[PDB]
Amino acid sequence: STGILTNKQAVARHFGVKQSEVVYFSVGVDLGGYKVIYDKETQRAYSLPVGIASGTTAVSLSTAAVLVHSAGSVDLGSLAVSREEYVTLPGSFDSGSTLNVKNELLTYTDGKYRWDGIL
Amino acid sequence: GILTNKQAVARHFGVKQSEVVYFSVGVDLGGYKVIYDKETQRAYSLPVGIASGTTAVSLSTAAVLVHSAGSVDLGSLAVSREEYVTLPGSFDSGSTLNVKNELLTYTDGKYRWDGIL
């Protein structure tokens, strides 16, 4: 919609890429040429690995941000970590929380932490 | 207007568009993760655990939020979460700091003011 276009614009400004380089995830969508992917259900965006060929289509995107496509698979959470693209969850260790992605950080009194174990 | 702004703000904090609320007197703060001040055009993560039915009373230029249950300095909360705004200019240009999460750039790095605002 128009809301989809303005959201691509907000996502793009956040990552510093072009509006057109943002793609919403949907089963079967062509992923080639895109730089960032947006999960409309979780409302989280992730940078995409460079090199996805045109013709490569999306298959599934888990809540742990694991993306399966026609040519293979990629953990977008891990990739985001390597790129220091993080989401700082609301609350803290004291308030408790639930982590679902590798790029989520929980704040403790001495700084932030990411979970490297089972999600 | 508001809807596209909630989008921009939500994508900045990594929350859902429906988890962003605008400040206004009386607004219900339950379940929201980020509050937006339309006057100063600044956004702040809200502390967790604000009971449903808790309504906003006032929001100062220093980002001190007063509500039904009590009050919270969103500036300090923002600092605890490393969520800052880097003001335009520098110590050379001079500036005015209004919130605890505002940074002023100097020749050797950035600084936040921990005194009277």
Side-chain angles (χ1 to χ4, degrees), chain A residues 1-40 42-119, chain B residues 1-38 40-117:
Chain A
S1 24
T2 316
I4 284 182
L5 278 164
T6 46
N7 187 58
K8 290 200 178 192
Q9 194 164 62
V11 169
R13 295 303 86 85
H14 184 78
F15 288 92
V17 301
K18 302 184 179 189
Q19 171 172 358
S20 52
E21 290 171 316
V22 177
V23 65
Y24 269 45
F25 167 85
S26 65
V27 170
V29 67
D30 172 45
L31 296 169
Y34 292 103
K35 304 310 177 186
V36 178
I37 187 173
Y38 176 78
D39 181 315
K40 73 165 80 73
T42 69
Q43 300 193 38
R44 293 284 170 88
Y46 305 90
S47 292
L48 284 163
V50 146
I52 308 278
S54 193
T56 297
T57 62
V59 160
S60 65
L61 180 61
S62 69
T63 62
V66 169
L67 168 75
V68 174
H69 50 72
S70 64
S73 187
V74 56
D75 187 331
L76 300 175
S78 277
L79 180 62
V81 164
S82 81
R83 293 172 59 83
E84 296 171 272
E85 284 164 346
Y86 291 109
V87 173
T88 299
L89 298 173
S92 59
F93 274 77
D94 193 51
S95 76
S97 187
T98 294
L99 289 75
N100 294 276
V101 203
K102 286 179 189 294
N103 80 329
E104 279 166 347
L105 301 174
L106 186 61
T107 309
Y108 182 56
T109 49
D110 66 15
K112 302 183 189 178
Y113 295 83
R114 64 184 180 82
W115 179 242
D116 195 45
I118 302 309
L119 285 176
Chain B
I2 299 174
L3 303 187
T4 63
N5 192 44
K6 275 169 152 74
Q7 276 186 337
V9 171
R11 297 311 154 251
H12 180 87
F13 289 89
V15 297
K16 293 181 172 193
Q17 178 181 338
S18 82
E19 295 169 330
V20 181
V21 65
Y22 267 43
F23 167 86
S24 71
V25 179
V27 79
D28 196 279
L29 307 159
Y32 288 107
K33 301 314 186 182
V34 179
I35 190 167
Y36 176 78
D37 185 315
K38 70 166 95 66
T40 66
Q41 289 181 51
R42 294 286 175 83
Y44 304 89
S45 289
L46 286 166
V48 160
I50 286 179
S52 194
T54 299
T55 54
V57 174
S58 62
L59 188 53
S60 74
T61 41
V64 172
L65 173 69
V66 170
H67 55 72
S68 330
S71 76
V72 56
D73 190 322
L74 299 172
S76 310
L77 179 55
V79 166
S80 76
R81 299 171 50 83
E82 302 177 80
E83 284 170 341
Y84 312 96
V85 165
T86 298
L87 294 177
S90 55
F91 274 81
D92 186 296
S93 78
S95 186
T96 293
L97 279 63
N98 286 295
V99 200
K100 288 164 133 53
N101 82 324
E102 285 178 333
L103 306 175
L104 188 55
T105 306
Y106 184 43
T107 69
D108 62 7
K110 299 174 180 191
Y111 297 81
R112 63 179 177 86
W113 181 247
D114 195 48
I116 300 302
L117 291 164

